[PDB]
Every structure is written in structure tokens, then in C-alpha cells.
């Protein structure tokens, strides 16, 4: 009874938080901030990326995890998002566009979670 309704609220919330990252655009240009986070770089094309980033993460993986109910709650999805953003900021230089995008997308995610409030 009360547990299927609670699983669905959690799953809904996870969709809302995912969609915030997916849809965010740069003011002025309309550039979609999430473009370079959608799929991890090709290992064949950029092997050095995988010597720096030991646990890769991208939105394709997180989308798969959401849809296949692999996360117990949004805190698990958020930890994957945070790993993705940390990877971006570890690999890319400070003041690069991808570095700044990771920062802004992480703030948007955190702000939308506070807006949703406690379960
Ligand atoms: Ni390093
Ligand atoms: Ni799978
Ligand atoms: Ni800032």
C-alpha cells in the first residue's frame, strides 16, 4: 500500500532531477550544457582519459540506472551525478567551458533537490 506510492514518488523525483540537468541551457547562446556529459569519451580514441578517470560516468549510464530501478533513492542517483561532475572537473582545466558547465549543472541539481523538499 504505502510502499508502492513511496517508490513512485522517489522515481518521479529522480526523473525531475534528471530532466533539470538534461534541459539546462546557457543564457544568450541557448547551448545545452549537458552535451559533453551524455556519453563518456571513446577509450579507443582517448586512452589517456581512462588513465586519469578510473570510474567513468555519463548521463546514458544514469538514465539506464533510473529506468531499470537500480537506485534505492535519489541520493544514489545524485552520487552518480556528482561522480560525473567530479570526473569532468578532474580531467578538464579550471576555467574551461566543460569545467564551468559541471559546476553550474551540479548547482542546478542541488537547487532543484532543495525545491522538491523532504520526501
Ligand atoms: Ni589526477
Ligand atoms: Ni544494466
Ligand atoms: Ni558559481
Residue numbers in the entry: 478 to 596
Direct quotes from the study:
The most notable structural difference within the BRD core fold is a hairpin insertion located between helix αZ and the ZA loop that is present in all family VIII members. The proximity to the Kac binding site suggests that this insert may play a role in recruitment of acetylated binding partners. The nuclear body protein SP140 as well as the related protein LOC93349 and PCAF showed nonspecific binding to most peptides.
Bromodomains (BRDs) are protein interaction modules that specifically recognize ε-N-lysine acetylation motifs, a key event in the reading process of epigenetic marks. The 61 BRDs in the human genome cluster into eight families based on structure/sequence similarity. Despite large sequence variations, all BRD modules share a conserved fold that comprises a left-handed bundle of four α helices (αZ, αA, αB, αC), linked by loop regions of variable length (ZA and BC loops), which line the Kac binding site and determine binding specificity. The four helices form a deep cavity that is extended by the two loop regions (ZA and BC loops), creating a largely hydrophobic Kac binding pocket.
